[PDB]
Design a protein around this ligand. Structure first.
Ligand SMILES: [K+]
Ligand SMILES: [Mg+2]
Ligand SMILES: [Mg+2]
Ligand SMILES: [Mg+2]
Ligand SMILES: [Mg+2]
Ligand SMILES: [Mg+2]
Ligand SMILES: [Mg+2]
Ligand SMILES: [Mg+2]
Ligand SMILES: [Mg+2]
Ligand SMILES: [Mg+2]
Ligand SMILES: [Mg+2]
Ligand SMILES: [Mg+2]
Ligand SMILES: [Mg+2]
Ligand SMILES: [Mg+2]
Ligand SMILES: [Mg+2]
Ligand SMILES: [Mg+2]
Ligand SMILES: [Mg+2]
Ligand SMILES: [Mg+2]
Ligand SMILES: [Mg+2]
Ligand SMILES: [Mg+2]
Ligand SMILES: [Mg+2]
Ligand SMILES: [Mg+2]
Ligand SMILES: [Mg+2]
Ligand SMILES: [Mg+2]
Ligand SMILES: [Mg+2]
Ligand SMILES: [Mg+2]
Ligand SMILES: [Mg+2]
Ligand SMILES: [Mg+2]
Ligand SMILES: [Mg+2]
Ligand SMILES: [Mg+2]
Ligand SMILES: [Mg+2]
Ligand SMILES: [Mg+2]
Ligand SMILES: [Mg+2]
Ligand SMILES: [Mg+2]
Ligand SMILES: [Mg+2]
Ligand SMILES: [Mg+2]
Ligand SMILES: [Mg+2]
Ligand SMILES: [Mg+2]
Ligand SMILES: [Mg+2]
Ligand SMILES: [Mg+2]
Ligand SMILES: [Mg+2]
Ligand SMILES: [Mg+2]
Ligand SMILES: [Mg+2]
Ligand SMILES: [Mg+2]
Ligand SMILES: [Mg+2]
Ligand SMILES: [Mg+2]
Ligand SMILES: [Mg+2]
Ligand SMILES: [Mg+2]
Ligand SMILES: [Mg+2]
Ligand SMILES: [Mg+2]
Ligand SMILES: [Mg+2]
Ligand SMILES: [Mg+2]
Ligand SMILES: [Mg+2]
Ligand SMILES: [Mg+2]
Ligand SMILES: [Mg+2]
Ligand SMILES: [Mg+2]
Ligand SMILES: [Mg+2]
Ligand SMILES: [Mg+2]
Ligand SMILES: [Mg+2]
Ligand SMILES: [Mg+2]
Ligand SMILES: [Mg+2]
Ligand SMILES: [Mg+2]
Ligand SMILES: [Mg+2]
Ligand SMILES: [Mg+2]
Ligand SMILES: [Mg+2]
Ligand SMILES: [Mg+2]
Ligand SMILES: [Mg+2]
Ligand SMILES: [Mg+2]
Ligand SMILES: [Mg+2]
Ligand SMILES: [Mg+2]
Ligand SMILES: [Mg+2]
Ligand SMILES: [Mg+2]
Ligand SMILES: [Mg+2]
Ligand SMILES: [Mg+2]
Ligand SMILES: [Mg+2]
Ligand SMILES: [Mg+2]
Ligand SMILES: [Mg+2]
Ligand SMILES: [Mg+2]
Ligand SMILES: [Mg+2]
Ligand SMILES: [Mg+2]
Ligand SMILES: [Mg+2]
Ligand SMILES: [Mg+2]
Ligand SMILES: [Mg+2]
Ligand SMILES: [Mg+2]
Ligand SMILES: [Mg+2]
Ligand SMILES: [Mg+2]
Ligand SMILES: [Mg+2]
Ligand SMILES: [Mg+2]
Ligand SMILES: [Mg+2]
Ligand SMILES: [Mg+2]
Ligand SMILES: [Mg+2]
Ligand SMILES: [Mg+2]
Ligand SMILES: [Mg+2]
Ligand SMILES: [Mg+2]
Ligand SMILES: [Mg+2]
Ligand SMILES: [Mg+2]
Ligand SMILES: [Mg+2]
Ligand SMILES: [Mg+2]
Ligand SMILES: [Mg+2]
Ligand SMILES: [Mg+2]
Ligand SMILES: [Mg+2]
Ligand SMILES: [Mg+2]
Ligand SMILES: [Mg+2]
Ligand SMILES: [Mg+2]
Ligand SMILES: [Mg+2]
Ligand SMILES: [Mg+2]
Ligand SMILES: [Mg+2]
Ligand SMILES: [Mg+2]
Ligand SMILES: [Mg+2]
Ligand SMILES: [Mg+2]
Ligand SMILES: [Mg+2]
Ligand SMILES: [Mg+2]
Ligand SMILES: [Mg+2]
Ligand SMILES: [Mg+2]
Ligand SMILES: [Mg+2]
Ligand SMILES: [Mg+2]
Ligand SMILES: [Mg+2]
Ligand SMILES: [Mg+2]
Ligand SMILES: [Mg+2]
Ligand SMILES: [Mg+2]
Ligand SMILES: [Mg+2]
Ligand SMILES: [Mg+2]
Ligand SMILES: [Mg+2]
Ligand SMILES: [Mg+2]
Ligand SMILES: [Mg+2]
Ligand SMILES: [Mg+2]
Ligand SMILES: [Mg+2]
Ligand SMILES: [Mg+2]
Ligand SMILES: [Mg+2]
Ligand SMILES: [Mg+2]
Ligand SMILES: [Mg+2]
Ligand SMILES: [Mg+2]
Ligand SMILES: [Mg+2]
Ligand SMILES: [Mg+2]
Ligand SMILES: [Mg+2]
Ligand SMILES: [Mg+2]
Ligand SMILES: [Mg+2]
Ligand SMILES: [Mg+2]
Ligand SMILES: [Mg+2]
Ligand SMILES: [Mg+2]
Ligand SMILES: [Mg+2]
Ligand SMILES: [Mg+2]
Ligand SMILES: [Mg+2]
Ligand SMILES: [Mg+2]
Ligand SMILES: [Mg+2]
Ligand SMILES: [Mg+2]
Ligand SMILES: [Mg+2]
Ligand SMILES: [Mg+2]
Ligand SMILES: [Mg+2]
Ligand SMILES: [Mg+2]
Ligand SMILES: [Mg+2]
Ligand SMILES: [Mg+2]
Ligand SMILES: [Mg+2]
Ligand SMILES: [Mg+2]
Ligand SMILES: [Mg+2]
Ligand SMILES: [Mg+2]
Ligand SMILES: [Mg+2]
Ligand SMILES: [Mg+2]
Ligand SMILES: [Mg+2]
Ligand SMILES: [Mg+2]
Ligand SMILES: [Mg+2]
Ligand SMILES: [Mg+2]
Ligand SMILES: [Mg+2]
Ligand SMILES: [Mg+2]
Ligand SMILES: [Mg+2]
Ligand SMILES: [Mg+2]
Ligand SMILES: [Mg+2]
Ligand SMILES: [Mg+2]
Ligand SMILES: [Mg+2]
Ligand SMILES: [Mg+2]
Ligand SMILES: [Mg+2]
Ligand SMILES: [Mg+2]
Ligand SMILES: [Mg+2]
Ligand SMILES: [Mg+2]
Ligand SMILES: [Mg+2]
Ligand SMILES: [Mg+2]
Ligand SMILES: [Mg+2]
Ligand SMILES: [Mg+2]
Ligand SMILES: [Mg+2]
Ligand SMILES: [Mg+2]
Ligand SMILES: [Mg+2]
Ligand SMILES: [Mg+2]
Ligand SMILES: [Mg+2]
Ligand SMILES: [Mg+2]
Ligand SMILES: [Mg+2]
Ligand SMILES: [Mg+2]
Ligand SMILES: [Mg+2]
Ligand SMILES: [Mg+2]
Ligand SMILES: [Mg+2]
Ligand SMILES: [Mg+2]
Ligand SMILES: [Mg+2]
Ligand SMILES: [Mg+2]
Ligand SMILES: [Mg+2]
Ligand SMILES: [Mg+2]
Ligand SMILES: [Mg+2]
Ligand SMILES: [Mg+2]
Ligand SMILES: [Mg+2]
Ligand SMILES: [Mg+2]
Ligand SMILES: [Mg+2]
Ligand SMILES: [Mg+2]
Ligand SMILES: [Mg+2]
Ligand SMILES: [Mg+2]
Ligand SMILES: [Mg+2]
Ligand SMILES: [Mg+2]
Ligand SMILES: [Mg+2]
Ligand SMILES: [Mg+2]
Ligand SMILES: [Mg+2]
Ligand SMILES: [Mg+2]
Ligand SMILES: [Mg+2]
Ligand SMILES: [Mg+2]
Ligand SMILES: [Mg+2]
Ligand SMILES: [Mg+2]
Ligand SMILES: [Mg+2]
Ligand SMILES: [Mg+2]
Ligand SMILES: [Mg+2]
Ligand SMILES: [Mg+2]
Ligand SMILES: [Mg+2]
Ligand SMILES: [Mg+2]
Ligand SMILES: [Mg+2]
Ligand SMILES: [Mg+2]
Ligand SMILES: [Mg+2]
Ligand SMILES: [Mg+2]
Ligand SMILES: [Mg+2]
Ligand SMILES: [Mg+2]
Ligand SMILES: [Mg+2]
Ligand SMILES: [Mg+2]
Ligand SMILES: [Mg+2]
Ligand SMILES: [Mg+2]
Ligand SMILES: [Mg+2]
Ligand SMILES: [Mg+2]
Ligand SMILES: [Mg+2]
Ligand SMILES: [Mg+2]
Ligand SMILES: [Mg+2]
Ligand SMILES: [Mg+2]
Ligand SMILES: [Mg+2]
Ligand SMILES: [Mg+2]
Ligand SMILES: [Mg+2]
Ligand SMILES: [Mg+2]
Ligand SMILES: [Mg+2]
Ligand SMILES: [Mg+2]
Ligand SMILES: [Mg+2]
Ligand SMILES: [Mg+2]
Ligand SMILES: [Mg+2]
Ligand SMILES: [Mg+2]
Ligand SMILES: [Mg+2]
Ligand SMILES: [Mg+2]
Ligand SMILES: [Mg+2]
Ligand SMILES: [Mg+2]
Ligand SMILES: [Mg+2]
Ligand SMILES: [Mg+2]
Ligand SMILES: [Mg+2]
Ligand SMILES: [Mg+2]
Ligand SMILES: [Mg+2]
Ligand SMILES: [Mg+2]
Ligand SMILES: [Mg+2]
Ligand SMILES: [Mg+2]
Ligand SMILES: [Mg+2]
Ligand SMILES: [Mg+2]
Ligand SMILES: [Mg+2]
Ligand SMILES: [Mg+2]
Ligand SMILES: [Mg+2]
Ligand SMILES: [Mg+2]
Ligand SMILES: [Mg+2]
Ligand SMILES: [Mg+2]
Lengths: 48, 275
RNA sequence: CGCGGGGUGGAGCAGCCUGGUAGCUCGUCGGGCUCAUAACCCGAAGGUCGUCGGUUCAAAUCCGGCCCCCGCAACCA
RNA sequence: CCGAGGGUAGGGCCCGUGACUGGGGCGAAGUCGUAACAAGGUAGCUGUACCGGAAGGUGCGGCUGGAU
RNA sequence: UGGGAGAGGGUGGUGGAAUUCCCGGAGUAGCGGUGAAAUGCGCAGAUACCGGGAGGAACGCCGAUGGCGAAGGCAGCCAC
RNA sequence: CGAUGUCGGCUCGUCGCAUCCUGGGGCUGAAGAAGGUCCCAAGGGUUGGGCUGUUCGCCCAUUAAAGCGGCACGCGAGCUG
RNA sequence: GAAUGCCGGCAUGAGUAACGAUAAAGAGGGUGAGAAUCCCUCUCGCCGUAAGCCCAAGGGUUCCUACGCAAUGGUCGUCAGCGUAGGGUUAGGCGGGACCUAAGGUGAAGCCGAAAGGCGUAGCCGAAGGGCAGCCGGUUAAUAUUCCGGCCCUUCCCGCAGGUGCGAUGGGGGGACGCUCUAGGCUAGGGGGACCGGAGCCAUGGACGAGCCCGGCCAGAAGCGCAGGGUGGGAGGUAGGCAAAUCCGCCUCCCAACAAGCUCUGCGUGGUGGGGAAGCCCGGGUGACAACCCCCCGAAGCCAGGGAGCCAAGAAAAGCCUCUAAGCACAACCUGCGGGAACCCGUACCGCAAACCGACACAGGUGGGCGGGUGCAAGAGCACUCAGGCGCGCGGGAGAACCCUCGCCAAGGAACUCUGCAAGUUGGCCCCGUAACUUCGGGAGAAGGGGUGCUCCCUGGGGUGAUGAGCCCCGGGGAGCCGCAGUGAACAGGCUCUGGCGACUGUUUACCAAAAACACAGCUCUCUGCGAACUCGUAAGAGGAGGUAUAGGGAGCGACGCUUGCCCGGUGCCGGAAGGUCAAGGGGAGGGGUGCAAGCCCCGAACCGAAGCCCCGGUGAACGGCGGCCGUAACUAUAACGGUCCUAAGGUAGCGAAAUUCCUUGUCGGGUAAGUUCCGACCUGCACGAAAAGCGUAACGACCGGAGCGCUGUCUCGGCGAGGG
RNA sequence: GAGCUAGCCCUGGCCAGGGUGAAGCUGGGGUGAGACCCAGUGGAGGCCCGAACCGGUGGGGGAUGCAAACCCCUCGGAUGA
RNA sequence: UGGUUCGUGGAGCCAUGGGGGAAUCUGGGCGGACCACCGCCUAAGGCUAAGUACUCCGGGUGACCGAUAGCGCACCAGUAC
């Protein structure tokens, strides 16, 4: 049957992307936390 | 003269449709249309705020002249009567001798080829617009400004009309289409005659899909829902109301008046409505 | 021996709660008016209060037991 | 090939009969009231309408086959 | 051909009397109703009187024992 | 109750005897035939249908007879639902 | 030593289940240490509206080549989407950007919010919509509308020539529109040829033939040809299109009019450039100077912005054209020609799947285009086949029980069972024929029946063409032939009668319920006079609605028919300027503390004092409710009638053992051999009843009940056979 | 977090083939004129049969599955909510 | 209304959303309702080291751990998944 993951590059970048995160107070905390934790990637990979 | 159909589908049994007999032109003026943004009953939050809206046929809004005192004294000619899907009345196209073109609500019995005009000196004649204080007592008028220069507010749907009852100072006494008696300022404009297409109320929609064409989605009874949804929700089997009949939001819906108590127009309502 | 209500002139109901008193409508009996009957008018009689036992100076009335009659309930499985 | 008739299937008319049900006629002395006949004690009749244990009553319009 | 009388019929318009309701004034202890009553209504101000307003229906006197129509039926007044 | 799946049916049996039939008897208000009642006996047998989820029961047609109970109201790691 | 403890290791079940669609395999020859499994050849089978081809999304080297087989691959492995290395994606015209705008997003102005932030006109962003210039062939191991060849075209800059009041983010035109049905003429595609080209073939009884087999085109600028779309010209006035306008809109005048003219597309033709089969012998080469022609069928595509009808009334903006303003008329724009200039990103490969989403090389899921032929009435259905692609990554045997999927069955024919569950039957098309009832449409494919192949002969109308022949499409009659059987295989209703419920088509518990449930047109009540009510929001602001009582919100009821009774005492709502009660506040009778005192400070009665409540009325398609005991008639029985108690009033019509009835399998009737179900009645209705509507209702239903006919392995009662295990 | 699912908004796309044959229109009949009837034409519809497509009715299989909802037969809608 | 130990308490003090609304030392606030007496202090402007907190960083030391311990990571770890 049709499952839950149906990838879509524009969707991905526009929902979880760097510019979406920077626009909003909670998004900047996501970025702040993932830097303090030392994540190699602050935001999902999508090829644009 | 609403039109019936033979019973060759279950729905054709009862469906009735307007005769469209007065319409003389079947596409609108390219210069007087604009796109009508369907809302689905959602506001700028994206939230539904008027339930059960959406899915209607695409429409173009026709710009309608509800002022008409824009052009005191300039006579116009009735070039066409047209179908307008944004209202129940028909609409009329006016070619002013100006060359300017406008749409107006089509009063009852207005004829293609005749002329209308706006102003204090205008004849008392079907289609003309005058400040209320110059229209003789007893006259049947439509498209009535509620306040001077603010725009024609009252008696605009198919077949409605207001009747001029008397004068009192700067104000005129009107009997609205609801039967209420009200003071309306004398300089407010009005148009002689009743709104046309009076048979509009005798159309029989005949099937559910027809309501879907109009943008009306199906309405769910409170008694059909669950307690988390509605005051009438729940119950084993069917259930009577079991409380004063209420809206989804809890307020009483059989008799409970809701006009605001201290509203300033109260000094202007003479008698409440009828029937 | 699940929980309620009732039993009082001939019928249908008060009085019981708050102990001392039996009442109301109809019906029945006698006499009027009527040619006569009903209606109407004047008078009259009939009830020891389902029963037994206790309390009391005194029980339709308060408390126990027995009879007779109506009503409600009987769920989770 | 036609063909008596037999078989299958589906209709039309008539008769008899059926739990139960609707009124109808009739029947020496049943129960309830008293609608009509006199101005019958609300003049009656009437077409229709609504209502009521029953006759009836009432509305609307009509008739004199009504009286003083 | 020229004349007449008529509530003959259909459409539009339109006049006054009267009842009801509404508003304003004025005014107070009852009004209404019946064979007699009670219900009802009235000091939260009724009835009775005046001014204004709204609305529907029916056309007094003329009018008659009258007139018209095939019958049912037809009555303020104006015009078609 | 850190689970002993619970009615009826179907399938498959097995057992008890307080015996429905078949076998052997006594008594009889046992003439015969046919019954009634009690005793011995569990080897074998104990049908097909209509109704109801039904167990049970009533009915139809038969029959030598259409027995009554136990096996976790026998049997859901065998089926049904 | 225990915590169904935690982490790790290793046992048991066990050489057990399983190795993933039952589309299917066999042999020869290669290679290699090793071969059912890799490569090649012949045979066989499977898909073919796909299981073939082209796009898009997603994936991200998986593509090509060489060398490899530890692990990955459900077995094997020499093979591979695996490991190592090298190689591979080429654009002014394709797609996106340097263009347009849609929802929406954002947002100078502005508005709002303790903060964070929320709004918001224009404007900006935003596409699979608008707009816009490239077609055919060749070449690589691997890219190609990109490289190459042939022939075309677009914009930008600059120069020359001719022309013109040139000039814009501004004004206008246009762009620019739905659904169903559809004309003319074409193209795609397809069928046939006794004509044209071709390597060959003659078999096993016949055939050297008007035999077999194969192939008979594609792209193209200007020009012309056919078919279409778009489109009035001139003049005078002019107050309107937020300045101006010679433009547009309005009025009048003359001419033009189913046309023509000008314009713009499509198709055909076209200089020219390409392609080219079988067979054959090593993707190649030959064929081959390949030929390339005629007839038919024919789109849903093209001409297109075509036509008609209908109601539910069918984006925007730019490019483009026209108008003028500032300005500039050495300029600038238009037209024709010439030279130059022309950037960024994608391009490999998979793509109904072993490379995408499902932990797997997973029988599931995934949007657009092409989708050939024959027969079957048609078709994208069904059967077989073209091109192309496969045989599904464990095999070999055996021929038990039992299981799955499938075939048949003597006599019986629902006896099975909760239930005909299941499986049979029926099954397309042509004709004949068809009932109650009905809202006159329907019920209807009612039911039930007959026909259906092939051959010869005669004949009717149509399409193309030319009216003829040919091709092709509908048919009509007569005479015969064969079989058990002619929609001979495949695809393709079993039917009737009668109840309950719901009018109906629809909708639902993704993944145990599809229904009688929700919805529905329609009916009623009620709120709402517009800055509406109502809804979301602290707000600003939105929705409602660019709507205005024939409108919008809320509620119940549920097509339609005939109807919807009595109770307003309680609760609700609605009306009531009296009266009663009532808060803060006003008022301050009279008290109290402190000071020597002026004064400061505290308490406080009466009285004035809203909504709400009380009280007075109204109101049921508002919440709701609609009696008990006893007596009575000239057989009995039963009570039309009466008596009395209680209520706010004591259930009317209609219906009733019901989707409701406990006693209950009520009683009687029908159907059956027999009927706790069914149907029709009755009425002591435990505990129907009139918009939580009452009683009916034609049509409808994968709803639930009862009966009959047809037919059956459901069953008496089982047997045999097939394949996967 | 609305790349699943639910509703709405903007813009696109898709629905083989066959069947039934409403209104209107034309002609004819009819009448004072009408209503209306007949024939032809016409192509309406939450119309009918049936693929794609969307569903998920009954049964069987599956049940450490091919699959954490699948498979086979059967069945509903298929110009419209 | 908040703050303080103070939860309405005899409830002052400090702060302040609403209403009313002075004075310039003979002016004003405080000493826990209020008055008197006696005292303390000068609101409605601003700034001001040090002593105090912490440990991303560097070093010093452990009756701290010693690869299931010690940080989640002794190791190419905020990685693989
Ligand atoms: K329970
Ligand atoms: Mg899904
Ligand atoms: Mg998606
Ligand atoms: Mg994307
Ligand atoms: Mg995308
Ligand atoms: Mg997206
Ligand atoms: Mg977002
Ligand atoms: Mg982003
Ligand atoms: Mg910040
Ligand atoms: Mg890094
Ligand atoms: Mg992130
Ligand atoms: Mg109709
Ligand atoms: Mg009809
Ligand atoms: Mg009209
Ligand atoms: Mg437009
Ligand atoms: Mg426009
Ligand atoms: Mg809007
Ligand atoms: Mg918004
Ligand atoms: Mg949000
Ligand atoms: Mg709403
Ligand atoms: Mg809505
Ligand atoms: Mg409207
Ligand atoms: Mg209109
Ligand atoms: Mg006004
Ligand atoms: Mg309506
Ligand atoms: Mg609409
Ligand atoms: Mg509605
Ligand atoms: Mg509803
Ligand atoms: Mg409910
Ligand atoms: Mg519910
Ligand atoms: Mg919720
Ligand atoms: Mg709640
Ligand atoms: Mg609630
Ligand atoms: Mg409720
Ligand atoms: Mg409920
Ligand atoms: Mg209930
Ligand atoms: Mg419910
Ligand atoms: Mg109710
Ligand atoms: Mg209730
Ligand atoms: Mg309520
Ligand atoms: Mg409210
Ligand atoms: Mg009003
Ligand atoms: Mg008492
Ligand atoms: Mg006493
Ligand atoms: Mg007495
Ligand atoms: Mg005598
Ligand atoms: Mg007497
Ligand atoms: Mg014979
Ligand atoms: Mg007697
Ligand atoms: Mg009488
Ligand atoms: Mg009499
Ligand atoms: Mg009389
Ligand atoms: Mg009398
Ligand atoms: Mg009466
Ligand atoms: Mg009185
Ligand atoms: Mg009084
Ligand atoms: Mg007074
Ligand atoms: Mg009135
Ligand atoms: Mg237990
Ligand atoms: Mg355990
Ligand atoms: Mg267990
Ligand atoms: Mg069985
Ligand atoms: Mg014996
Ligand atoms: Mg004997
Ligand atoms: Mg004997
Ligand atoms: Mg014995
Ligand atoms: Mg035995
Ligand atoms: Mg035995
Ligand atoms: Mg039984
Ligand atoms: Mg039992
Ligand atoms: Mg029983
Ligand atoms: Mg015997
Ligand atoms: Mg037993
Ligand atoms: Mg037991
Ligand atoms: Mg038991
Ligand atoms: Mg068992
Ligand atoms: Mg089981
Ligand atoms: Mg069982
Ligand atoms: Mg077990
Ligand atoms: Mg077992
Ligand atoms: Mg067990
Ligand atoms: Mg069950
Ligand atoms: Mg221990
Ligand atoms: Mg464990
Ligand atoms: Mg543990
Ligand atoms: Mg342990
Ligand atoms: Mg563990
Ligand atoms: Mg380890
Ligand atoms: Mg372990
Ligand atoms: Mg191990
Ligand atoms: Mg092991
Ligand atoms: Mg082992
Ligand atoms: Mg073994
Ligand atoms: Mg074993
Ligand atoms: Mg296994
Ligand atoms: Mg497996
Ligand atoms: Mg298969
Ligand atoms: Mg198979
Ligand atoms: Mg196959
Ligand atoms: Mg072989
Ligand atoms: Mg082989
Ligand atoms: Mg091998
Ligand atoms: Mg090998
Ligand atoms: Mg193999
Ligand atoms: Mg090979
Ligand atoms: Mg061979
Ligand atoms: Mg094919
Ligand atoms: Mg991947
Ligand atoms: Mg290997
Ligand atoms: Mg290996
Ligand atoms: Mg190696
Ligand atoms: Mg492996
Ligand atoms: Mg595998
Ligand atoms: Mg090798
Ligand atoms: Mg090797
Ligand atoms: Mg490559
Ligand atoms: Mg190029
Ligand atoms: Mg550039
Ligand atoms: Mg833009
Ligand atoms: Mg912030
Ligand atoms: Mg954007
Ligand atoms: Mg853009
Ligand atoms: Mg685009
Ligand atoms: Mg568009
Ligand atoms: Mg392009
Ligand atoms: Mg080209
Ligand atoms: Mg090469
Ligand atoms: Mg110019
Ligand atoms: Mg347009
Ligand atoms: Mg439409
Ligand atoms: Mg054509
Ligand atoms: Mg072509
Ligand atoms: Mg063809
Ligand atoms: Mg001008
Ligand atoms: Mg060649
Ligand atoms: Mg050559
Ligand atoms: Mg198409
Ligand atoms: Mg087109
Ligand atoms: Mg068109
Ligand atoms: Mg726009
Ligand atoms: Mg100048
Ligand atoms: Mg110059
Ligand atoms: Mg020019
Ligand atoms: Mg650039
Ligand atoms: Mg690039
Ligand atoms: Mg490429
Ligand atoms: Mg698929
Ligand atoms: Mg692949
Ligand atoms: Mg595989
Ligand atoms: Mg994979
Ligand atoms: Mg797969
Ligand atoms: Mg071909
Ligand atoms: Mg066919
Ligand atoms: Mg295979
Ligand atoms: Mg396959
Ligand atoms: Mg396999
Ligand atoms: Mg094997
Ligand atoms: Mg074997
Ligand atoms: Mg055979
Ligand atoms: Mg058989
Ligand atoms: Mg049979
Ligand atoms: Mg048979
Ligand atoms: Mg049966
Ligand atoms: Mg049985
Ligand atoms: Mg069943
Ligand atoms: Mg069959
Ligand atoms: Mg068949
Ligand atoms: Mg019949
Ligand atoms: Mg019939
Ligand atoms: Mg029938
Ligand atoms: Mg019927
Ligand atoms: Mg009919
Ligand atoms: Mg048939
Ligand atoms: Mg037929
Ligand atoms: Mg024949
Ligand atoms: Mg043959
Ligand atoms: Mg069929
Ligand atoms: Mg339904
Ligand atoms: Mg339903
Ligand atoms: Mg119903
Ligand atoms: Mg109905
Ligand atoms: Mg449908
Ligand atoms: Mg479900
Ligand atoms: Mg569920
Ligand atoms: Mg679930
Ligand atoms: Mg299911
Ligand atoms: Mg359900
Ligand atoms: Mg269904
Ligand atoms: Mg539902
Ligand atoms: Mg509903
Ligand atoms: Mg319905
Ligand atoms: Mg209404
Ligand atoms: Mg709110
Ligand atoms: Mg706030
Ligand atoms: Mg708006
Ligand atoms: Mg209805
Ligand atoms: Mg309905
Ligand atoms: Mg309902
Ligand atoms: Mg009827
Ligand atoms: Mg009634
Ligand atoms: Mg009441
Ligand atoms: Mg009341
Ligand atoms: Mg009340
Ligand atoms: Mg008050
Ligand atoms: Mg109640
Ligand atoms: Mg009550
Ligand atoms: Mg009954
Ligand atoms: Mg019964
Ligand atoms: Mg019933
Ligand atoms: Mg009941
Ligand atoms: Mg019963
Ligand atoms: Mg029962
Ligand atoms: Mg019985
Ligand atoms: Mg019987
Ligand atoms: Mg029955
Ligand atoms: Mg009875
Ligand atoms: Mg109910
Ligand atoms: Mg029905
Ligand atoms: Mg029916
Ligand atoms: Mg249905
Ligand atoms: Mg259904
Ligand atoms: Mg049945
Ligand atoms: Mg049957
Ligand atoms: Mg049968
Ligand atoms: Mg069998
Ligand atoms: Mg086998
Ligand atoms: Mg999306
Ligand atoms: Mg989604
Ligand atoms: Mg569209
Ligand atoms: Mg379709
Ligand atoms: Mg047909
Ligand atoms: Mg026809
Ligand atoms: Mg037409
Ligand atoms: Mg349909
Ligand atoms: Mg059909
Ligand atoms: Mg299924
Ligand atoms: Mg599905
Ligand atoms: Mg089945
Ligand atoms: Mg499962
Ligand atoms: Mg399946
Ligand atoms: Mg199937
Ligand atoms: Mg279709
Ligand atoms: Mg269908
Ligand atoms: Mg639609
Ligand atoms: Mg504190
Ligand atoms: Mg505090
Ligand atoms: Mg304090
Ligand atoms: Mg303050
Ligand atoms: Mg001082
Ligand atoms: Mg001072
Ligand atoms: Mg202070
Ligand atoms: Mg102090
Ligand atoms: Mg002190
Ligand atoms: Mg101090
Ligand atoms: Mg410091
Ligand atoms: Mg140590
Ligand atoms: Mg370690
Ligand atoms: Mg560690
Ligand atoms: Mg350690
Ligand atoms: Mg660290
Ligand atoms: Mg570290
Ligand atoms: Mg660790
Ligand atoms: Mg570690
Ligand atoms: Mg790592």
């Amino acid at each position: 049957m049709k499952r839950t993951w149906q990838p879509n590059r524009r969707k991905r970048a526009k929902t979880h992307g760097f510019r979406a995160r920077m626009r909003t107070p909670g998004g900047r905390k996501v970025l702040k936390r993932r830097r303090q934790k030392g994540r190699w990637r602050l935001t999902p990979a999508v090829r644009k | 003269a609403v039109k019936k159909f033979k019973p060759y589908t279950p729905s054709r049994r009862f469906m009735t449709v307007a005769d469209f007999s007065e319409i003389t032109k079947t596409e609108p003026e390219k210069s007087l249309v604009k796109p009508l943004k369907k809302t689905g009953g959602r506001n700028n939050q994206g939230r539904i705020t008027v339930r059960f809206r959406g899915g209607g046929h695409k429409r173009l809004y026709r710009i309608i002249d509800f002022k008409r005192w824009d052009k005191v004294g300039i006579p116009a000619k009735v070039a066409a009567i047209e179908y307008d899907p944004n209202r129940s009345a028909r609409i009329a196209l006016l070619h002013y001798v100006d060359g300017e073109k406008r749409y107006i609500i089509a009063p009852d019995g207005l004829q293609v080829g005749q002329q209308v005009v706006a102003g204090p000196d205008a004849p008392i004649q079907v289609g003309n617009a005058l400040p209320l204080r110059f229209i003789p007592v007893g006259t049947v008028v439509h498209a009535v400004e509620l306040e001077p220069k603010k725009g024609a507010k009252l008696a605009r749907a198919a077949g409605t009309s207001a009747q001029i009852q008397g004068r009192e100072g700067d104000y005129v006494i009107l009997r609205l289409p609801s039967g209420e008696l009200r003071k309306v300022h004398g300089e407010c404009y009005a148009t002689v005659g009743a709104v046309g297409n009076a048979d509009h109320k005798n159309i029989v929609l005949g099937k559910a899909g027809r309501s879907r064409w109009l943008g009306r989605r199906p309405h769910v009874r409170g008694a059909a829902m669950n307690p988390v949804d509605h005051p009438h929700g729940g119950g084993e089997g069917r259930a009577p109301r079991g409380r004063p009949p209420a809206s989804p939001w809890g307020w009483q819906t059989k008799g409970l008046k809701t006009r605001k108590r201290r509203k300033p127009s109260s000094r202007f309502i003479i008698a409440r409505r009828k029937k």
